[PDB]
Design a binder for this molecule. Sequence first.
Ligand code: HEM
Ligand SMILES: [C-]#N
Ligand SMILES: [Xe]
Ligand SMILES: [Xe]
Ligand SMILES: [Xe]
Ligand SMILES: [Xe]
Length: 121
Amino acid sequence: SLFAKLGGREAVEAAVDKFYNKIVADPTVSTYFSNTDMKVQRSKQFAFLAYALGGASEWKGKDMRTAHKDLVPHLSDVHFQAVARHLSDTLTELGVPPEDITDAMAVVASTRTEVLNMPQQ
Ligand code: HEM
Ligand SMILES: [C-]#N
Ligand SMILES: [Xe]
Ligand SMILES: [Xe]
Ligand SMILES: [Xe]
Ligand SMILES: [Xe]
């Protein structure tokens, strides 16, 4: 699985950690997390990514749409692209093969419609 390919528990823990260090340092998105526990958020993101990356069989948290839909200001592609870029940058700095970054980005991108509370067409 992508999860195992990336390096497993340890790699993903490092990615999520370094990823969120960028999140709070970016005024484009940091404000959304002002009232958030960033350690709990680290926990949740790992659990979801692990599932999304094929490392876990279940995701028990909130569905992406429910999770972000009521955030203000309404999430657009400016925030989604920032988050994507931050993860890409994260993995690149963690020494991940570019082809692996391609697959992980694809998994993250596949959550666009729900995360952005957009019409399913
Ligand atoms: C791009 C793909 C994204 C993924 C895969 C993702 C993943 C997650 C996950 C797993 C949660 C936990 C939900 C729960 O409570 O079970 C969450 C919540 C949250 N997300 Fe995201 N997210 C994404 C995009 C974004 C973006 C673009 C923003 C804003 C710029 C954002 C801000 C937040 C906030 C503020 C929460 C709730 C924090 C809290 O409960 O205090 N997310 N997201
Ligand atoms: C972003 N969680
Ligand atoms: Xe990773
Ligand atoms: Xe990741
Ligand atoms: Xe990440
Ligand atoms: Xe993410």
